[PDB]
Design an enzyme around this catalytic site. Structure first.
Site: not given
Ligand SMILES: [Zn+2]
Ligand SMILES: [Ca+2]
Ligand SMILES: [Ca+2]
Ligand SMILES: [Ca+2]
Ligand SMILES: [Ca+2]
Length: 316
Positions: A142-143, A146, A157, A166, A226, A231
């Site tokens: 996941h990271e 990005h 974002y 996301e 957020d 998210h």
């Molecule tokens: Zn993320």
């Protein structure tokens, strides 16, 4: 570090033993020279200054409990690199074999992981909500995804573009988990979330509403928390991606599934060819339909399932 490539052994966060690529120069360093310009893993030493110190070990054995988050960050970055290379013909996150850097033991009690524009960063968790976050391969992938997004579509974002950002990281995090065959599922973070509670996770792609996230565009979050719900509203796109792959009937709309491989091919093409920094959900649908058209033809089942999945979540 300049030195000799070798292989060490250690134990990860979940107690599993694995081999890791290291470099020998007086010490053994967590530096993998077999992938691109290298994978480098650093110790942040419970501080917030980054990257910290390149991880050094005296004997090439990594069985101390302090070692575990480093072993997994280092190993799973390698697996993610392999996924992008073998499946998508992409050399590291920038397409030109950029070095992958990760720091572990970030801060104290830090219940998160992130890409900071230059590297990955993993907390250890507080022991109750989270154990060290590099223990989940879906978290690591996941990271690192990005980073791929930052170098390609550049989705900003916030608001819908951020929710897409996301969702892309959740989708490819899950596909990497399936590629490694590490007890794969359609949940995010289950391996490192709430060690005291079994069967749960941070987010669900199969059923986002399980944890209160929207599964239909009519239920999207419209406030300012957020970063405008990045998210939260990712659940709408995650559900669409789950439907494209696995099929199902959702709010009365039936989707024939086309499988994980084609889902990955469609979304990777959308990301690298058609999405832009300000793309919204409706432009994502168009990009995904066009990608499937490019790959399988305008009258394919594949195009039809992409359309039905987005219809099912209410994205026109
Ligand atoms: Zn993320
Ligand atoms: Ca050692
Ligand atoms: Ca799993
Ligand atoms: Ca998972
Ligand atoms: Ca749990």
């Amino acid at each position: 570090i300049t030195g000799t490539s070798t292989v060490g052994v250690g134990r990860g966060v979940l107690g599993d033993q694995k081999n890791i690529n290291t470099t020998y120069s007086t010490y053994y360093y967590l530096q993998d020279n077999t992938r691109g310009d290298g994978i480098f893993t650093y110790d942040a030493k419970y501080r917030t200054t980054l990257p910290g110190s390149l991880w050094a070990d005296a004997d090439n054995q990594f069985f101390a409990s302090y070692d575990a988050p480093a072993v997994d960050a280092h190993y799973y970055a390698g697996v993610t690199y392999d996924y992008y290379k073998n499946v998508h013909n992409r050399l590291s996150y920038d397409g030109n074999n950029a070095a992958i850097r990760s720091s572990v033991h970030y801060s104290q009690g830090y219940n998160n992981a992130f890409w900071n524009g230059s590297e990955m960063v993993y907390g250890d968790g507080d022991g109750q909500t989270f154990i060290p976050l590099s223990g989940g391969i879906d978290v690591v992938a996941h990271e690192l995804t990005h980073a791929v997004t930052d170098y390609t579509a550049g989705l900003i974002y916030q608001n819908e573009s951020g929710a897409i950002n996301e969702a892309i990281s959740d989708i490819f995090g899950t596909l990497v988990e399936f590629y490694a065959n590490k007890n794969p599922d359609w949940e995010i973070g289950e391996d490192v979330y709430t060690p005291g509670i079994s069967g749960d996770s941070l987010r669900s792609m199969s059923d986002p509403a399980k944890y209160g996230d929207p599964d239909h565009y009519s239920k999207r979050y419209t406030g300012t928390q957020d970063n405008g719900g990045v998210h939260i509203n990712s659940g709408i796109i995650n559900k669409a991606a789950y439907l494209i792959s696995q099929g199902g009937t959702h709010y009365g709309v039936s989707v024939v599934g086309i499988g994980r491989d084609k889902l990955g091919k469609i979304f990777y093409r959308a990301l690298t060819q058609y999405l832009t920094p300000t793309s919204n959900f409706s432009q994502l649908r168009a990009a995904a339909v066009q990608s499937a058209t490019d790959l399988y033809g305008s009258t394919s089942q594949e195009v039809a399932s992409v359309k039905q999945a987005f219809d099912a979540v209410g994205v026109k």
